[PDB]
């Protein structure tokens, strides 16, 4: 379980360009700031990386898709998910990669902003409150979501496991092989809970409380697919890109 788990978290610090670890430094016990047009403007130059609320969106879209495949790196190296067919493997990505990424957003934020661009500059949320209203509504909730599972304190080895524990989730719809796939999650989460065990002695109810998170992030993306709905129905002009479109077509 433990030598499963170290396994979990080693792929983890392979695949992942920024960790949670690296994150609270740059925030700091252990960037550029963008909150206008004029900033954004700076960054877009000097630390490298149609209207401004779009092209928040358009990063925020580059963002995710580049996350989606550090995701997919992790997710392949683990052996029992390489072990399942293809179709299996991008049925179980397809759903379960925005509820990792949102839980993995979390690392990067605090209470008045996010690091972009590997840690180089912080957006700050005030920022991006202030834009049009349908791009302003997306990214706050996350906010909310962050700041309250930050409280728990998990650290990358907790992450690793928590978003194994996502991915490989037995419930996903089409997914061909079943219990193939909870019998994989089921070991991930007595993996996860006797390693919080060790890791967190004194945190009481905190396996209990990594569950219902996991439920409010079925939510949380339940509630982001509605918003990128709307967007693609209202929203004319602003491009999307065709593997997101991939995602959310059902
Ligand atoms: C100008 C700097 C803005 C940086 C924004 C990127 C930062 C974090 C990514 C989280 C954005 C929230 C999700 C937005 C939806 C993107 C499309 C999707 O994959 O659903
Ligand atoms: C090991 C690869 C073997 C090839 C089998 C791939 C065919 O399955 C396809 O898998 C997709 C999800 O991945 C579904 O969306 C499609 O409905 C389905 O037709
Ligand atoms: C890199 C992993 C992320 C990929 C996730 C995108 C999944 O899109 C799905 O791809 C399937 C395979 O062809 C299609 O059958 C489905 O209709 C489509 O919705």
């Known amino acids: 379980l433990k030598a499963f788990s170290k396994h979990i978290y080693n792929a983890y610090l392979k695949n992942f360009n920024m960790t949670k670890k690296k994150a609270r430094s740059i925030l700091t016990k252990a960037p550029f700031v963008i909150h206008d047009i004029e900033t954004l403007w700076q960054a877009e130059k000097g630390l490298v990386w149609k209207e401004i609320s779009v ?18 790196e992790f997710a392949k190296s683990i052996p029992s998910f390489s072990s399942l067919f293809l179709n299996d493997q991008v049925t179980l990505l397809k759903y379960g990669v925005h509820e990792a990424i949102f839980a993995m957003l979390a690392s990067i934020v605090n209470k008045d902003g996010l690091l972009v661009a590997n840690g180089s500059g912080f957006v700050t949320r005030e920022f991006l409150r202030s834009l049009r209203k349908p791009f302003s509504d997306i990214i706050e909730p996350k906010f909310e979501f962050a700041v309250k599972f930050n409280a728990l304190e998990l650290d990358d080895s907790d992450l690793a496991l928590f978003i194994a524990a996502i991915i490989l989730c037995g ?21 996860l809970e006797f390693h919080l065990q060790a890791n967190h002695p004194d945190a009481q109810q905190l396996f209990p409380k990594l569950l219902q998170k996991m439920a409010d992030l079925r939510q949380l993306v339940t509630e982001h697919a509605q918003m990128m709905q709307r967007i693609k129905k209202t929203e004319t002009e602003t491009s999307l890109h065709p593997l997101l479109q991939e995602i959310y077509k059902d």
Request: proline share 5%; hydrophobic share 35%.
């Open 171 to 191: 419930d996903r719809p089409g997914l061909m092989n079943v219990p193939r796939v909870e019998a994989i999650q089921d070991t991930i989460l007595r993996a």
């Open 55 to 72: 092209h928040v969106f358009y990063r925020c879209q580059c963002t995710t898709v580049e996350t989606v495949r550090e995701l997919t």
